[PDB]
Design a binder for these strands. Sequence first.
RNA 1: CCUCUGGUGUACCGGUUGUGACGCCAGUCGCAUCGCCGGGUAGCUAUGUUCGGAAGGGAUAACCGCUGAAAGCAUCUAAGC
Length: 174
Amino acid sequence: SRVAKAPVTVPNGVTVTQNGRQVEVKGSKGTLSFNLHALVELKQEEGKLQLAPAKESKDAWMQAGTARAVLNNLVKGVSEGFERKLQLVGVGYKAAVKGTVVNLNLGYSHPIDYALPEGVTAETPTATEIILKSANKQLLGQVAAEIRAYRSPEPYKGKGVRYSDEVILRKEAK
RNA sequence: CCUCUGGUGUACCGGUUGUGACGCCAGUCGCAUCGCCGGGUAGCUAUGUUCGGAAGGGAUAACCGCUGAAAGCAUCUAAGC
């Protein structure tokens, strides 16, 4: 596996520790923990990191590749972090943030109140845009997915919640 | 379930035909589908009255995902959620 063979770099300030199988990643953003498969072994030499199979099985190579990908994502997130960005399209559609809660109007008979999970923060420079930032890429993706599922876009006029870099199929009636 | 609206209510009250009897008048009783007719207490009852199928958890079906390699890309799946 090219991924599993490629190593990852610990930039300056993040410490990665291990006990049993539970790898832990520490930095400015916060703690991030990742369990490890039985067929995968981890070698920490200098600032670089190396995942390697414990046997020659293709399954072991697969587990090594996914473990390296997830650990690289964690190392990148704990130092820099990720943000997603969300756009709203349609008249009367609006968003606001009151601390940990997002208040949304999407053309229903009642406004929607979404609680944000711990670790994800949101900002609203404008009623049309939302910015979501977190250190956990999976959590950020899940929260963005739920917000989009509240009103997914439609193809005739493109109204609804959309990702920033999302291509939306457009058609024309009759 | 029987407070209300009704039905039934042959041991409750009354009107009335024929006949026989209680010595006779008066007053009563037997029999005639409870003789026939008009009402009707409890109980039972519907066509009457009240109530019920409310709300909430947990695991899922089709389906929709997050992150993610095998397969440097992509991918809901193989680890995980």
